[PDB]
Design a protein around this ligand. Structure first.
Ligand SMILES: [Fe+3]
Ligand SMILES: [Fe+3]
Ligand SMILES: [Fe+3]
Ligand SMILES: [Fe+3]
Ligand SMILES: [Fe+3]
Ligand SMILES: [Fe+3]
Ligand SMILES: [Fe+3]
Ligand SMILES: [Fe+3]
Ligand SMILES: [Fe+3]
Lengths: 169, 169, 169, 169
């Protein structure tokens, strides 16, 4: 038994390892999205930078979980990170809708991980999840939803071009 | 009779109390408008901030009247502030037209309150109304009218999106 | 179903709407208290400013709940905000005791809303309530209690006058 | 007929001359009050400075009326300024009540002068009175009323001493 281990169950430890892989997968998806919009036949530089930043955020999420795993005395076990399910991401609206779907899947996984911690009485882990993940997911899902609404509002063509300039930094 | 009371009639005092309630109602209406545009299926952040600022202005109007009531030696009597007459405010153009209608109703109420002060010979109250309310109402009604004209000019979709970015801070 | 909605029940949504109305009611009560102490036959400027600040805080509480409602994908439904139950608030001690009673009622309502979120498994909403409301209520109830103790200690007359100068900014 | 004279009646001109004398009388009264509180058997330095400042304000009021008289093409006719009706002004509360009575008498005289301007159609004079005198009188009468309430609240002795330190600069 590792030196720090206290009130830390193997199921909670295994849940963190599977959440680490999912965060790395989201990181990979956003990285793919970012360079899709850097294609010369797509060429939307606001979308490129927006998804690059989200990719870096998801990598921070994964590493924070790795750090937490060590803090509690668990052991990181890494798996393959699967390639994203698409090579190309359509319009700015398509990519934003794919992004909402991804973020809601990540959120459900975090809520399920909270449920593991809850049944095992892992009081500190529950607060760590709420404070550093659940609140941010709620913020991001609201922001992406707003973006989707505005991408429908502006339409294709000049509208998409203007959204890229005005809504994304 | 209160210590400051001089040239201050009960009808004027009662008129101020009813104007206080109307200003609080306008405050509530703009607050509702503001958070309607913060909905994820509306998502117009310029409209949100614009109506939040107007809501704060109407609250200042109400409190200035409460302060004046005390200055003259009257007594504030508060009533329920009714919920706004709509839950949802349509397009940016619809909300701007509802706002013009509200501001003109407030202006007519102020003009009617000026008429009470005039017939009672309340010289100071008349100047207080003209200097701190009537002039501002004329400015606001002109600004909202301009906004309505431009919201018709730009049309729906990208036009509404652009107006949100360019005409509202 | 709105775009952001995830793990967000209609009972929780309805509880937030009723809490919004209660926060606006507390805002209205403190606004009434503030201008009661600005009366020329009361004339306690520390009390006036103290209750004005608390009124602004309660308005922030209401708007934060409106913002949260939108974040989760709920819909704000506003109701009449009832006028406060008193027109006049007695001595500084009476107003402070009315204020403690109000704050404890708000606190119980928040605890009841936490109970709704708990039974529905709304993990993020529970943390939002604890972090942004429950902690502040505990602080305020302790501060008001201290003020009540000191208002009894100093007595009426010069004591109330001195408390206004020394204990309220 | 003087060069600037336009829409300026002899009754309005005579009313300004009598108001000038009244402002100088108020100046003299406050000057007497100020040095009464500088007596070694009174010795309230906040009261002394407060009434000295009010005396200087009333002198400014008189001179502004003299300036206005010249602006419109009238002619200043000065009269004796009568000594104040008391040699000694009692307690701080007595002096504050005498001061409220004086200010209300000045206010009624200004309102009567406004009535002269109104019946003669002197539009500019009416606005000059409202903007530079009537508004300030309403402010001062409210402030003095507040002071009277607090002087009753604190009582005699230490209360009066504390009011002198805390409520008057
Ligand atoms: Fe993540
Ligand atoms: Fe994210
Ligand atoms: Fe207003
Ligand atoms: Fe005027
Ligand atoms: Fe307005
Ligand atoms: Fe609150
Ligand atoms: Fe509070
Ligand atoms: Fe004067
Ligand atoms: Fe004065």
């Amino acid at each position: 038994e590792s030196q720090p281990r206290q009130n830390f169950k193997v199921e909670t430890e295994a849940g963190i390892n599977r959440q680490i892989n999912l965060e790395l997968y989201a990181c990979y998806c956003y990285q793919s999205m970012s360079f899709y919009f850097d294609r010369d036949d797509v060429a939307l530089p606001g979308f490129t930078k927006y998804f690059k930043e989200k990719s870096d955020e998801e990598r921070e999420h994964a590493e924070k979980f790795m750090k937490y795993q060590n803090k509690r005395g668990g052991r990181i076990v890494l798996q393959d990170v699967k390639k994203p399910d698409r090579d190309e991401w359509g319009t700015g609206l398509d990519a934003m809708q794919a992004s909402l779907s991804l973020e809601k899947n990540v959120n459900q996984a975090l809520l399920d991980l909270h449920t593991v911690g809850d049944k095992e009485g892992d009081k500190q882990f529950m607060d760590f999840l709420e404070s550093d993940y659940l609140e941010e997911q709620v913020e991001d899902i609201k922001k992406i939803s707003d973006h989707i609404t505005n991408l429908k509002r502006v339409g294709s063509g000049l509208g998409e071009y203007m959204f890229d300039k005005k809504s994304l930094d």
